[PDB]
Every structure is written in C-alpha cells, then in structure tokens.
Design an enzyme around this catalytic site. Structure first.
Site, PDB file in Angstrom:
ATOM      1  CG  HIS A  45      39.981  10.491  51.213  1.00 24.98           C
ATOM      2  ND1 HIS A  45      41.608   9.156  51.735  1.00 24.98           N
ATOM      3  CD2 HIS A  45      39.460   9.671  50.618  1.00 24.98           C
ATOM      4  CE1 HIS A  45      40.810   7.847  51.786  1.00 24.98           C
ATOM      5  NE2 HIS A  45      39.812   8.213  51.604  1.00 24.98           N
ATOM      6  CG  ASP A  93      44.649  10.423  53.087  1.00 24.46           C
ATOM      7  OD1 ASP A  93      43.481  10.385  53.363  1.00 24.46           O
ATOM      8  OD2 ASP A  93      43.769   9.745  51.936  1.00 24.46           O
ATOM      9  N   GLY A 186      34.696   2.574  50.302  1.00 28.58           N
ATOM     10  CA  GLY A 186      33.783   2.744  51.067  1.00 28.58           C
ATOM     11  C   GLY A 186      35.433   1.585  52.363  1.00 28.58           C
ATOM     12  CB  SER A 188      39.001   5.452  52.789  1.00 35.02           C
ATOM     13  OG  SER A 188      39.313   5.036  51.258  1.00 35.02           O
ATOM     14  N   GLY A 189      40.735   4.831  55.131  1.00 38.58           N
ATOM     15  CA  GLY A 189      41.207   5.025  56.395  1.00 38.58           C
ATOM     16  C   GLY A 189      41.272   3.612  57.118  1.00 38.58           C
TER      17      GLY A 189
HETATM   18  B1  LIG Z   1      38.223   6.350  50.262  1.00 38.02           B
HETATM   19  O1  LIG Z   1      37.743   7.379  50.412  1.00 38.02           O
HETATM   20  C1  LIG Z   1      38.899   6.564  48.927  1.00 38.02           C
HETATM   21  N1  LIG Z   1      40.550   7.287  48.147  1.00 38.02           N
HETATM   22  C2  LIG Z   1      40.097   8.218  47.208  1.00 38.02           C
HETATM   23  O2  LIG Z   1      39.123   8.521  46.990  1.00 38.02           O
HETATM   24  C3  LIG Z   1      41.134   9.124  46.998  1.00 38.02           C
HETATM   25  C4  LIG Z   1      41.712  10.232  48.435  1.00 38.02           C
HETATM   26  N2  LIG Z   1      41.839   9.561  45.780  1.00 38.02           N
HETATM   27  C5  LIG Z   1      41.776   8.391  45.109  1.00 38.02           C
HETATM   28  O3  LIG Z   1      41.939   7.165  44.767  1.00 38.02           O
HETATM   29  O4  LIG Z   1      42.083   8.903  43.619  1.00 38.02           O
HETATM   30  C6  LIG Z   1      42.837   8.093  42.456  1.00 38.02           C
HETATM   31  C7  LIG Z   1      44.349   8.524  42.222  1.00 38.02           C
HETATM   32  C8  LIG Z   1      43.974  10.281  41.657  1.00 38.02           C
HETATM   33  C9  LIG Z   1      46.120  10.403  42.039  1.00 38.02           C
HETATM   34  C10 LIG Z   1      46.710  10.094  41.650  1.00 38.02           C
HETATM   35  C11 LIG Z   1      45.872   8.332  42.299  1.00 38.02           C
HETATM   36  C12 LIG Z   1      45.261   7.733  42.317  1.00 38.02           C
HETATM   37  C13 LIG Z   1      39.103   5.068  48.094  1.00 38.02           C
HETATM   38  C14 LIG Z   1      39.415   4.929  46.013  1.00 38.02           C
HETATM   39  C15 LIG Z   1      40.605   4.235  48.697  1.00 38.02           C
HETATM   40  C16 LIG Z   1      40.421   2.678  48.475  1.00 38.02           C
END
Ligand SMILES: *B(O)[C@@H](NC(=O)[C@H](C)NC(=O)OCc1ccccc1)[C@@H](C)CC
Ligand SMILES: [Ca+2]
Length: 240
Positions: A45, A93, A186, A188-189
């Site tokens: 993502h 992911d 910030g 993620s990954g």
């Molecule tokens: B990393 O860049 C980020 N992750 C995301 O935005 C992920 C892809 N999505 C997310 O947190 O969506 C909320 C959700 C949607 C559907 C089911 C459960 C939760 C950050 C936020 C990770 C630390």
C-alpha cells in the site's frame, strides 16, 4: 508510533525510510526493512501511488544530518501478485524494492533477520514497532525514530468479535491494542521486531489500524506475517 519513546541511534539498523520526491523536497511516507544490500521489504500500500521513491538507510533524524545516511533510488518494485488495494483485509500487504545501488553495511546499516517460514508467535510475545509515523492520531510525524513495546495478540484473540473479528486473517500478526501505543500513518511497511532465540527478528510489516484512530483499545496494529511469505520473498530475489 503512538505512545513510543525515542530509539537509540544504533538500535534498529535494518530500519529504512521510504520517501517520495515532493516538489523540490523528499517526503517520508513509510517504513521498510533492509533484507539484502540491494533489497528492501515494505507494504504494497506504500507503493499504490506511482511516485518517485528513494530509500534512506542509517537514518535517525528526518530533518537533520546525522552523518550516517545513505540515499538510494528505487530501481524496481515487486508487489505481491494478489495484493488488492481496495481490500487491505484480504492480506497480501507486502512489496519488495530493488535498490539502484547496493548500500554499504556498517554499525548503522545492517540486514534485518527474517523468521523461518511458518513461524507463529505465542500470544503476548515481546515485540517492538519502530518508525517515524504520527505520534498521535491526526498528529504529525516524529522527527526521530520512535519505538513502542508492542506485545502480540494471537490469531484466536485477534479474530474474536471484540477485537478485529473477521478482518484479521492468519496471514497477519496483531500487536498491542492497549489504547496507548500503536503504529500510525507514516509507520506502514515498517518492522515488528520480536525476540526469538536471543535474536530480534522482523515478524511484522506494518499494515493497518482502525478507521477510528491509531491507538484504539482492542484494535491492535496489524502487520503482514512475514513467515507466511518467505518462499515468495526468496523466489523474487532469486529471480530478479
Ligand atoms: B500505511 O501507509 C497505513 N495503512 C493503510 O492506510 C491501510 C492500507 N489501510 C487502513 O489502515 O485502512 C483502515 C481499515 C480499512 C479496512 C479494514 C480495517 C481498517 C497506516 C495507517 C498503517 C500504520
Ligand atoms: Ca538525518
């Protein structure tokens, strides 16, 4: 990282900063882990948008010179074939970045250790999250690398109705959930480092949190279970 404490400089030498060319500057967007001299592991993502990316290794302060940084371009991105942007909760992911150059290893720049394929951690295993993401929900980036003690929550508990329910799969790792500490935008990954047989190994690749906010009691941070991918990871690198 919500609820974290500043890391010691030398502490997590496989941590990278994934950034994109923003205007004339370079903006931090994700974490990663350096898994070869010329490969980084991160979340797919992070790389949904088609930007210009670079990796920073030996990084500690985003905003100052530490004397330790190496800055490499991202030559090639391999996202998991099944990853689906509209469906984070399906899993998958994870992405690999092949770097334009091999980085030089030193005290500040080391490879992160991956777990053996199939490994599953007992509930309440002692793990840490690191990264430079938001220090509150809807807050702002950390300038320095933050670490939070984030003990796992097993699958059975995690998929229970009062945690994530169905949204967590057995291809993920849950950690924390206490309402105080978490990852945030910030992060993620990035790594979830856990202590197995007196090594820190990277078991988690930060993936998602609650829509309601980062540190939500009984919505732990959810990470791609690295030990679920080992054979995919090795096949990519062997093949590219
Ligand atoms: B990393 O860049 C980020 N992750 C995301 O935005 C992920 C892809 N999505 C997310 O947190 O969506 C909320 C959700 C949607 C559907 C089911 C459960 C939760 C950050 C936020 C990770 C630390
Ligand atoms: Ca710096």
């Amino acid at each position: 990282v919500v609820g974290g404490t500043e890391a010691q400089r030398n502490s997590w030498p496989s941590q990278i900063s994934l950034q994109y060319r923003s205007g004339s500057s370079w903006a931090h967007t994700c974490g990663g882990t350096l898994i070869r001299q010329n490969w980084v592991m991160t979340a797919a993502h992070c790389v949904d948008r088609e930007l210009t990316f670079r990796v920073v290794v030996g990084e500690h302060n985003l905003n100052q010179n530490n004397g330790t940084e190496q800055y490499v371009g991202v030559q090639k991105i391999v996202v998991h074939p099944y990853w689906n942007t509209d469906d984070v909760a399906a899993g998958y992911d994870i992405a690999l970045l092949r770097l334009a150059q091999s980085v030089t290893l030193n005290s500040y720049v080391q490879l992160g250790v991956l777990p053996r394929a199939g490994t599953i951690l007992a509930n309440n295993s002692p793990c840490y999250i690191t990264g430079w993401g938001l220090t509150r929900t809807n807050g702002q980036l950390a300038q320095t690398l933050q670490q939070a003690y984030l003990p796992t929550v097993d699958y059975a508990i995690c998929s229970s109705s009062s945690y994530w329910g169905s949204t967590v799969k057995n291809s993920m790792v849950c950690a924390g959930g206490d309402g105080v500490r978490s990852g945030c935008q910030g992060d993620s990954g990035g790594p979830l480092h856990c202590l197995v047989n007196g090594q820190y190994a990277v078991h988690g690749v930060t993936s998602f949190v609650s829509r309601l906010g980062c540190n939500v009691t009984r919505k732990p941070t959810v990470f791609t279970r690295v030990s679920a991918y080992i054979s995919w990871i090795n096949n990519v690198i062997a093949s590219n």
